[PDB]
Amino acid sequence: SMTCPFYKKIPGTGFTVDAFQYGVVEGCTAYFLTHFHSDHYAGLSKHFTFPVYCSEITGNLLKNKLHVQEQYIHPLPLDTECIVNGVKVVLLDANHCPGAVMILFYLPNGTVILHTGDFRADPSMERSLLADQKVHMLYLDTTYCSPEYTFPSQQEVIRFAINTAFEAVTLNPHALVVCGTYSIGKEKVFLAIADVLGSKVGMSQEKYKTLQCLNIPEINSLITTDMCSSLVHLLPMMQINFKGLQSHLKKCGGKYNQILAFRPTVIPQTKGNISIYGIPYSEHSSYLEMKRFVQWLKPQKIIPTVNVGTWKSRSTMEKYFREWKLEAGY
Amino acid sequence: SMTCPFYKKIPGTGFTVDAFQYGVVEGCTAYFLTHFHSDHYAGLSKHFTFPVYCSEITGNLLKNKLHVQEQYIHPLPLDTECIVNGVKVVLLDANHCPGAVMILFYLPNGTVILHTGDFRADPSMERSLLADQKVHMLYLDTTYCSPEYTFPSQQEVIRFAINTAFEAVTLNPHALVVCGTYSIGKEKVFLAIADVLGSKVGMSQEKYKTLQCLNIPEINSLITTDMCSSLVHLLPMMQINFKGLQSHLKKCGGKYNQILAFRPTVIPQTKGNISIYGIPYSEHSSYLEMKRFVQWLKPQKIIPTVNVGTWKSRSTMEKYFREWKLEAGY
Ligand SMILES: [Zn+2]
Ligand SMILES: [Zn+2]
């Protein structure tokens, strides 16, 4: 009996969010997709025949990577009042990956609901349409909802990578910088690295086609499939190990004599002319970022969407929410 | 300067093996693909316009999963003398994954070369066409070419899984058995589990379509997309953790009240009504299996195809080969 979970349903509507892996959801009048990560689009394919509401970047990926039929894809602009089945909704930048959004639902009866999808809370969100009215219910990405989860800011990670890469290529003009990636994400990191080095980013034709879906301005002048004309390469995450990088260095035919690689997980692992830096890159809120966003939003009700498998996890999170509400006075 | 490595070239011919990620390989007259693993087919797509020689199962996957054009796919039968560009070749079962083959090349000048692709050496190979003549050069999958690498036989792993599953469902008829999988592989494990339980294997429509490509006899009577009509489910490897399995148990709506899961890596990790067994499943030769195969084949020359990134690794392997040759007297 495949059952869609509670945290994927929008109360007072027939709306679901990221609920494509349960077959036909009874009484669902509109299916939203917050972003193009396989955990969330799972189940979508060329055989799907209900309307999918999503951002334009997400729509491009649905069309070109999953071959969802164009007639069922309903892309919506960001930061704009839109209507779906008589209900007003706004898509907000989730600061997660390209095309990723939070969804703000304005119920005709006056209730206002935010579904964050996956997000990394940011002070800029306090400047968004969220500011213009009271938000009653919050469906919250609680991936790192525990005080242990501390990591640097996105800008700190990018600054570290820029500095490390610039210095390494300064000391050795024959060095190659490698960034590991999945299908999307990390664009701001590897584009900044290539920028400081005055280089395009080299990659496979498949990764190149993927980046064409992302509406990045002037993208063709930033990326190339001609690998050996660049100083920065993208490789699959699973190749970022000494064996995989030695192999890539051999594959480049002597054009480079050293690789410096970054991967998400600071002192590098070094074996000869290969070095690997694990960087604390994250597409989700830290505990403190999350706490700040929630104390600013002051929702009446919070529904966690992640780590809700046991009672202990759910109740520990409810405890933090009560403490937050007490300290901020709502 | 993208360069195809030496271990992917067949000497005395214009043949390459699993060399699709280097653009046009200069002077390559025929491209072989040993099996459908992304490390090996990497680079293949609908835009490829040279002939690809492979098994029929691999050909099905190329056509239906990668949309390689049918006119460039050249499937060949197993255990059968075939001709490619005037050269006689045989495809042999590699005992690796469905459709995976080793390739035996019969050069017009009398030289005989075996490329194992990925393989798990088996005594049955000693009964193959390999027996009928002397093999001069061996391009060897050396994934676990180190004495530390010991693990049970495939039959021992399958027997353990059958027994554990049968006993768990005997003690609790409401339990669910889960097997984690990538795109292909492990069929003999999860089909045997379902067999002993008198059940079909439930799975997503995507995994169902994949298994239809594998020429498994009577397959439609062994698998289903109607999950809750079965006792054995397949999930993505990355979902095989307590959070992912708790979530799946919720998704099944109370049909089951317990999950017992197997994954490749014996005492289970248990948290309440979820248990996870790491099983030492392998699609590659153990050190001892490899040693036995090579001492039986007695090749004049061995060329390792894996772990050849450093001199230390290459020379350590050459040392084992010399010791093997000395002990067996060739
Ligand atoms: Zn995500
Ligand atoms: Zn393989």
Residue numbers in the entry:
A (entry chain A), B (entry chain A): 698 to 962, 976 to 1040
From the paper:
The two human DNA exonucleases containing an MBL-fold are SNM1A (also called DCLRE1A), a factor important for DNA interstrand cross-link (ICL) repair, and SNM1B (also called Apollo or DCLRE1B), a DNA repair factor that also plays an key role in maintaining overhangs at telomeres. The SNM1A and SNM1B/Apollo proteins are both classic 5′-3′ exonucleases, requiring a free 5′-phosphate to initiate digestion, but are members of a class of DNA processing factor family that have not previously been structurally characterized. The protein exhibits two structural domains: the metallo-β-lactamase (MBL) domain, arranged as a sandwich of two mixed β sheets (α/β-β/α); and the β-CASP domain, which is characteristic for a subset of MBL nucleases: CPSF-73, Artemis, SNM1A, Pso2, as well as RNaseJ. An extended active site in both enzymes includes, in addition to the canonical di-zinc catalytic centre, a binding pocket that defines the selectivity for terminal 5′ phosphate, and a wide binding groove which is essential for processivity and for the ability to digest past DNA damage sites.
Structures of SNM1A were solved in two different crystal forms at resolutions of 2.16 and 2.19 Å; the structures are virtually identical, except that crystal form B is lacking two N-terminal amino acids present in form A (RMS difference of 0.57 Å). Structures of SNM1A in two different crystal forms show only a single zinc ion. Comparison with SNM1B shows that all residues involved in zinc coordination are conserved; all are in the correct positions, except for D736 which is a different side-chain rotamer. However, it is likely that the active form of SNM1A also depends on the presence of two zinc ions, as demonstrated by the complete dependence on an aspartate (D736) for nuclease activity that should coordinate the missing zinc. When looking from the direction of the active site, SNM1A is predominantly positive, while SNM1B is only moderately so. Remarkably, the reverse side of both proteins is predominantly negative. The electropositive surface regions in SNM1A, identified with Roman numerals in Figure 1C, can probably be attributed to the following residues and structural features: (I) residues K1022, R1024, K1029, R1032 and the dipole of the last α-helix of SNM1A, which is non-helical in SNM1B; (II) residues R697, K698 and K699; (III) residues K743, H744 and K760; and (IV) K940, K947, K948 in the β-CASP domain. In SNM1B it is well ordered and makes hydrogen bonds (via T257 and S258) to the second tartrate molecule. This segment of the chain is partly disordered in the SNM1A crystal structures; it is possible that the ordered conformation is stabilized by, or dependent upon, the presence of the ligand. A striking difference between SNM1A and SNM1B is that while both are similar in overall structure, they differ markedly in their charge distribution, with SNM1A having a very pronounced area of positive potential surrounding the active site.
